[PDB]
Amino acid sequence: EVQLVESGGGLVKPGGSLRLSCAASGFTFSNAWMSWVRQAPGKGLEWVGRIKSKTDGGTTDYAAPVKGRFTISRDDSKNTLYLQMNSLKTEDTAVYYCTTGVETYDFWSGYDYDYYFRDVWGKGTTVTVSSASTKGPSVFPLAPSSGGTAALGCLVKDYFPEPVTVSWNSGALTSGVHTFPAVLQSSGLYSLSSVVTVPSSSLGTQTYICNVNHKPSNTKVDKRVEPKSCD
Amino acid sequence: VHEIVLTQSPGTLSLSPGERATLSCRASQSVSSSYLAWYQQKPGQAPRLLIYGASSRATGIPDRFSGSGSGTDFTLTISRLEPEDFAVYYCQQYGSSFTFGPGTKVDIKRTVAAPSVFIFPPSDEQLKSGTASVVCLLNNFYPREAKVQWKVDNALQSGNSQESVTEQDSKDSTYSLSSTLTLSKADYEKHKVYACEVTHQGLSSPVTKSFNRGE
């Protein structure tokens, strides 16, 4: 039952420090090389670093953007791997995974003391670097005109931190709903959009309310959207 | 020994179930001992190791996955794609350098579908707040490539708009894009016609959707 559990991720001001811990279970942690690999929002995977086994010297290799700021260590007595992050920058915001990695899987001669071995990854822990304060969003309507299909939506703007949940009609409307991934604006706040398509003949028969929930600031909003009144 | 840069050609591979996928992975210099690996990542999940050492696959990986290559060029091959094989694929070196590849998405294939284009002016509440957000919605289109161009009194906007794209819709396998143009209230009230022009493969000519401020 191989398993890695990350912990320590959270919100940090730029320049601060943060210690990520990774607890191992189900395999011989002392004989494994351990790697930290991060993934920024919507971007590709990036290798942060790797520490070797005690037998292989236990030396560390670091990626270039984190070389003089991040430090990887290990505690064998409690099967833990540590990533110490100092002088945090905004571009360090990412989900961090710990893994045994391809070096461990390859130098183990496929599968295995004990019985076997398999490549293991953690669930990941999210590290957010931002000097922004907690702020609830403003919800604005995206009102339509029409032809046959009409689109109407909700703009959930200027909130921090993530996430925000958007449903429609208390969750009783799912068909044709497209909720887009949030965008980080240069102001430091997040913006999100949630649109719905619907036959125009039901614009006077049925009502449409988007329910927005931002739990970090304890904000609940129910915005009714309808075609803009020409008056 | 120096650091090696890694390029993963191509960027995207449009593909249908049952077809044969061929992903390439190029390098800057020779990968030491052919230490190149292939991982698969589905959204919301951690990566899954598929191939290690150019051509050796891991325990449990189905036989349809294979790898090959050496020196400066490597290849991942899928013989018959299952409904679960649509994901992003990365290659990682671990000889002398340990960088990942840019990635390569494998999305479902379908008939070309033109986007439905809608435009939404800023609400009066937001204008009371002091900012104006105009929204251009491109709905239910395929393929992924699309171009949105903002025009304010025929002035091409650049640097004040942001785009968000959904994943492939599980039912119709299409995409949706949302573009937001952000202006100040002062700058918004100095212009009349606001338009977004969409360019997509399923359109004979770019389609412009517009409104006049206060109409």
Numbering used by the authors:
A (entry chain H): 1 to 52, 52A, 52B, 52C, 53 to 82, 82A, 82B, 82C, ...
B (entry chain L): -1 to 27, 27A, 28 to 94, 96 to 213
What did the published study say regarding this structure?
Broadly neutralizing antibodies (bnAbs) to the HIV envelope (Env) V2-apex region are important leads for HIV vaccine design. Most V2-apex bnAbs engage Env with an uncommonly long heavy-chain complementarity-determining region 3 (HCDR3), suggesting that the rarity of bnAb precursors poses a challenge for vaccine priming. HCDR3s for these bnAbs mediate binding by reaching through the conserved glycan shield to contact a positively charged, semi-conserved protein surface on strand C of the V2 loop (Andrabi et al., 2015, 2017; Gorman et al., 2016; Landais et al., 2017; Lee et al., 2017; McLellan et al., 2011; Pancera et al., 2010, 2013; Pejchal et al., 2010; Sok et al., 2014). We then engineered ApexGT Env trimers that bound inferred germlines for PCT64 and PG9 and had higher affinities for bnAbs, determined cryo-EM structures of ApexGT trimers complexed with inferred-germline and bnAb forms of PCT64 and PG9, and developed an mRNA-encoded cell-surface ApexGT trimer.
In the previously reported apo crystal structure of a PCT64 LMCA variant (with three light-chain mutations that confer neutralization to autologous viruses), the HCDR3 formed a collapsed coil (Rantalainen et al., 2018). Here, we solved the apo crystal structure of the true LMCA Fab and found a similar collapsed coil/disordered HCDR3 conformation. In our PCT64 LMCA complex structure, the HCDR3 adopted a beta-hairpin conformation resembling more mature PCT64 antibodies (e.g., PCT64 13C), which suggested that either the apo coil conformation was a crystallization artifact or that PCT64 LMCA binds via an induced-fit mechanism.
